[PDB]
Design a protein around this ligand. Structure first.
Ligand SMILES: NC(=O)C1=CN([C@@H]2O[C@H](COP(=O)(O)OP(=O)(O)OC[C@H]3O[C@@H](n4cnc5c(N)ncnc54)[C@H](OP(=O)(O)O)[C@@H]3O)[C@@H](O)[C@H]2O)C=CC1
Length: 476
């Protein structure tokens, strides 16, 4: 079906064992000095060997690091690669409460390496930031955010980007040899997980065609919370939920009843018989969320959350993005979804659906902050599944008709790269397929691969797309 054809899935496939020799030239290891204690960090430093140069990235000071890096580069001459262990800094930045320190520091490292003219490829290491292989547990959604940023650094600075590697919980000599082997030569891969069974690499595939009933989706009932519910996609989702028998929709946004279109939306929904509550509630405000949940009826408990809150504006290239900009992009995604997770972890929800983006699937130049924010959502859904809780993450492509991409400027950008505008009914029908399957993660996007693949891969290859036959054909 056409709706099937919108759905894609990230998978992890086995790739080659790397060679046995460590890099010939010198590595530069980058450590977050207040977050250098984790076992995997010590194991990686041990694996890189004592000739590896160490740079402690203190605080968040681009200009200072640029100067310190420039000095290292003059002394040592060309490095073979830069190996970042900054991801281990999960604590929130003191000045930017939605930004994990390691994410902030990774952005500033990519900036400062450019400033100082270090050209060695940057590798960003994580531990538990992806779910790769069977029964794999994504233990750190925070580090998962950093894959969204990385993929964009690979699009904006392909010539000085190495890639991303997730380490296993215990980095034994085999795992260590896979790491140092990859640093010597990564066989055209750049999104990698090292596991007990071997090295895996990230792949995009067409999803399995829809099987009704397979995931045992319960009938829509009770109260359903749609954050950003007065927005473009949120309002169409609310409508669909109303058509499918929700008793009570709770729609939130910062503007609430003052949102553009809110009265027309309420009236459309109420015609269907549904009880409607529209609340002004910043999704990153934990106290406000708790007050909202405490208000719910005895006879209309929360059954589902659809997290549609989000902004994409005021992003910037990796070279330019500020921490203040990053914070504002993370807020409705990382901070809000964390709250939603924590305050609903006990409620035994039927659905907990996070609205992500293709920006986090493959990356989009100009949108590092948004890619990171959405990559957190994808990672949080996997994490929640490991806890035995329901979750999904839907990475939308471009929507037609309502929502963000109904600015000519942004719409014009996306469709020219081959990420075409979906009809809302098609997008929603594909989401219903995903929910009926009870899939954890999907991209739902209308693609022209003949446009997208050759453009996306102009500056470096994408192993990611080798498992999409239309992309392979477009490159032939
Ligand atoms: N449209 C598209 O093509 C795509 C959209 N997406 C994602 O889908 C979701 C919906 O997008 P769309 O409907 O198009 O965009 P809209 O701008 O139409 O809707 C976004 C909604 O989120 C609300 N919002 C923003 N920040 C907050 C906050 N801090 N707290 C609570 N509400 C917030 C907005 O209201 P207010 O300003 O009043 O808070 C608005 O209701 C977003 O998360 C977006 O990233 C992903 C890929 C593609």
């Amino acid at each position: 079906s056409h709706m099937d054809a919108l759905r894609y899935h990230i998978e992890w496939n086995r790739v080659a064992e790397p060679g046995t020799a460590r890099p010939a030239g010198r590595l530069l290891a980058v450590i977050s000095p207040d977050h250098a204690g984790a076992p995997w960090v010590t194991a990686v430093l041990d694996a890189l060997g004592p000739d590896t140069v160490r740079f402690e990235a203190k605080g968040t000071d681009r200009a200072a690091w640029a100067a310190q890096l420039a000095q290292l580069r003059e002394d040592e001459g060309e490095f073979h690669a830069v190996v970042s262990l900054l991801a281990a800094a999960e604590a929130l930045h003191t000045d930017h409460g939605s930004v994990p320190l390691g994410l902030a520091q990774t952005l500033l490292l990519a900036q400062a390496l450019g400033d100082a003219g270090l050209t060695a490829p940057l590798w960003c290491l994580t531990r538990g930031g992806v779910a790769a292989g069977r029964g794999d547990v994504l233990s750190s959604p925070v580090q998962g955010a950093l894959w969204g940023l990385g993929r964009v650094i690979g699009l904006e600075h392909p010539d000085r980007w190495g890639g991303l590697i997730d380490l296993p919980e215990t980095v034994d000599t085999r795992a260590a040899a896979r790491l140092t082997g990859l640093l010597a030569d990564a066989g055209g891969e750049d999104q990698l997980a090292i596991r007990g069974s071997g090295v895996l690499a990230r792949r995009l595939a067409h999803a399995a065609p829809a099987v009704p009933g397979s995931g045992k989706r319960p009938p829509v009932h009770g109260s359903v919370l749609v954050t950003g519910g007065t927005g473009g996609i949120g309002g169409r989702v609310a409508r669909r939920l109303a058509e499918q028998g929700a008793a009570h929709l709770v729609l939130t946004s910062r503007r609430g009843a003052d949102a553009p279109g809110a009265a027309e939306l309420r009236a459309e929904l109420e015609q269907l018989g549904v009880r409607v509550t529209i609340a002004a509630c910043d999704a990153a405000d934990r106290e406000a969320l708790a007050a909202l949940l405490a208000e719910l009826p005895e006879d209309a408990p929360l059954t589902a959350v659809f997290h549609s809150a989000g902004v994409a504006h005021d992003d910037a290239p990796v070279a330019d993005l500020t921490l203040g900009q990053l914070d504002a992009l993370m807020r409705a995604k990382l901070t809000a979804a964390r709250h939603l997770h924590e305050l609903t972890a006990d409620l035994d929800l039927d659905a907990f659906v996070l609205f992500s983006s293709t920006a986090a699937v493959w990356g989009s130049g100009g949108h590092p902050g948004y890619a990171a924010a959405n990559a957190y959502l994808d990672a949080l859904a996997e994490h929640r599944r490991s806890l035995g809780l329901t979750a999904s993450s839907v990475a939308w492509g471009t929507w037609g008709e309502v929502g963000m991409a109904t600015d000519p400027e942004v719409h014009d950008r996306l469709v020219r790269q081959g990420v075409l505008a979906m009809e809302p009914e098609h997008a929603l029908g594909a989401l219903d397929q995903m929910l009926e399957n009870d899939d954890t993660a999907a991209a739902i996007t209308l693609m022209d691969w003949e446009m997208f693949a050759p453009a996306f891969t102009a500056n470096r290859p994408s192993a990611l797309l080798s498992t999409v036959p239309e992309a392979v054909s477009a490159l032939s």
